[PDB]
Structures are given as C-alpha cells and as structure tokens.
Write a protein that binds this ligand. Structure first.
Ligand code: HEC
Ligand code: HEC
Ligand SMILES: [Zn+2]
Lengths: 136, 136
C-alpha cells in the first residue's frame, strides 16, 4: 500500500547522475544535481534481468551553488522512490512511487497513489518503467 | 610502489559529486562531472577515524554534454586514485597517487611518483590529505 522509506540508500550502488539547470522543462520541480541509487534487487533489473519484488530505485536531488566555474552540491531538496511489488503496486505497473521532501521519512509528497509519476514512467514500459541505464 | 588499479570501485560508496565547468583553474585536466567513491576502509577515515592501510579513494571523471539546460554524462575521461599505505607511500604522506586514462588499468597518468598530486593534497594535512567530506 505505502512505499517504505529506503533506509541506508546512501550506501547503495550509484547508477548515474545528471544536472537539470534553469530553462530545462523539468527545472520545476527536479532542478539540481540528481544521483540515482539501486539496491541489489534493482541492479538485477538494471543489468537486463527482471526486477524482483523489493527492488528499490532512489532519485536523490540536491540543489547546487555556482562556485567559480564549479557546480557544488548544496542542500538535499527531495528523494523520489520506486519500490517493486508486482501485486501491491499493480495499479501503477508493479512499481510504488513516493517522494520525501528533503529526503525526510516524515515528508511524504505523493497524493494520487503515484498515478502522476506512473503517467510519465509509462513511456518506458519496454524497460519496466525505468529511465536510468546502468553505465560503466 | 605502484598504486593498484581499484577493480570494482563502481560498487563502492558514493561520497560526493561536483561539476567542473570550462574556465575553472583545473578544467585541464579534470573538467567534467566527477564522482568520489570510497572503499570500506576509506569510509573509516571519512567518518573521522585514521585512514587504515588499504583505504582507497577514487575520483571518477566523466565528460558531459550540455543539452537543453541538462548536463548529461558522456564518456569517462579518467579516474584519480589515492591508495593508503603509510610505509610504501611514505614519500607522499602515506597515500599513493595514480591516474588511469578512461579508467583503464593500462593507461597510467602519473609520471613524477605523485609529487604534483601530493603538492596540492598537502594543504589538507589536517584531514589526512583528503578534500572530499562525507555528506548524508
Ligand atoms: C516525466 C514528466 C516524469 C515524471 C512525472 C516523473 N519522473 Fe521519475 N524520472 C523521469 C526521468 C526522465 C528520469 C530519469 C533521470 C535520469 O537521470 O536519467 C526519472 C527517474 C526516476 C527515478 C530513478 C529510476 C529511473 O526510472 O530512472 C525515480 C526513483 C523516479 N524517477 C521517481 C519518480 C516519482 C516518485 C515521481 C512522482 C512523484 C516521478 N518519478 C515523476 C521522469 C519523470
Ligand atoms: C590541487 C591543485 C590538486 C591537484 C594537483 C590534485 N588534486 Fe586531487 N583533488 C583536489 C580537490 C580540490 C579535490 C576535491 C574534489 C571534490 O569533489 O571535492 C580532489 C580530490 C581527489 C580525490 C578524491 C579524494 C579527495 O581527496 O577528495 C582523489 C582520489 C584525487 N584527488 C587524486 C588526485 C591525483 C591522482 C592527483 C595527481 C595526479 C591529484 N588528485 C592532484 C585537488 C588537487
Ligand atoms: Zn570566470
């Protein structure tokens, strides 16, 4: 029913990163430096296996500061969380979608059962609703 | 007295990231998006302990493409590597300094036994020659 807060996600595998800057269509609300993390189960899916129930992907979003031709990580703005449960999250393609303001377990953001999240991630049906690609 | 190639570093703990853009005093050679990784042993030092022998820090440098106000990871340019051995690397303050072109074990970049690396990292003697700070 609810997505679990992914405790210890900072110790997980770093999948990839990207920076979204002002002018980007998604500056509101995912402007900043983001890092994608995967637990062991999510790595199975990312490698081209299937995602086991209990796979978790985290979108970790930082604000950044301009420091002399460097973008420096500032405060955490939020995390997004995808948790795999084929049965419990069947209404949103087997992934539960949640946001935590500032990465705080007490600041749950999603109000529509993740239908908005799923609406965009649906475009990625062929890669099991995951945008991020495992890179070397 | 050569630094070992840190095989499996991509599975290690992600410490932090930073973007170095053109015009930065160090754009040559570390312009791009970099990610710092730490093995279990390096984490002990980042948390406020003594860096044990066998601690490894990796500076993982990607080129990026600026595309519609996103900075998107491209190809790996290089890795930098600090390997802790108080005895073997005593001439450079107990860290061995190496680079690998494109992160490939056969493309060693350091030609002065790491004296140039050490010359800058010496400013951080008080944090055992490490710039990166562990963040949550
Ligand atoms: C399109 C308009 C999107 C909406 C709405 C949401 N997400 Fe999404 N998400 C999107 C992109 C383009 C990416 C890839 C970023 C990259 O660096 O390549 C993501 C990624 C995630 C991830 C990581 C897993 C993955 O699919 O790559 C998570 C955990 C995630 N997003 C969660 C999430 C939630 C909880 C949303 C609703 C609150 C949500 N997303 C909206 C595109 C879009
Ligand atoms: C100053 C003029 C530097 C020189 C020359 C070298 N490095 Fe360094 N390095 C520098 C900074 C400011 C940072 C921090 C980056 C950040 O995101 O905060 C780094 C970092 C590293 C790391 C990561 C560990 C750390 O100390 O934070 C490694 C593994 C590293 N550098 C290796 C390295 C090597 C191999 C060098 C000579 C080839 C070298 N660096 C030189 C500053 C400077
Ligand atoms: Zn300038």
């Amino acid at each position: 029913t609810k997505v679990k807060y992914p405790d210890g996600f900072r110790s997980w595998y770093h999948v990839k990163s990207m920076v979204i800057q002002p002018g980007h269509p998604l500056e509101n609300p995912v402007g900043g430096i983001h890092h994608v993390y995967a637990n062991a189960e999510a790595i199975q899916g990312l490698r081209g296996g299937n995602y086991p129930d209990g796979a978790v992907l985290v979108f970790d979003l930082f604000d950044y500061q301009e420091d002399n031709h460097a973008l420096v990580e500032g405060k955490r703005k939020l995390i997004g969380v995808m948790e795999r449960d084929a049965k419990r999250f069947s209404a949103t393609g087997g992934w539960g979608y949640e946001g935590f303001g500032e990465g705080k377990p007490d600041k749950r953001l999603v109000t529509d059962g993740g239908q908005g999240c799923f609406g965009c991630h649906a475009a990625q049906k062929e890669s099991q609703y995951v945008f991020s690609r495992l890179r070397d």
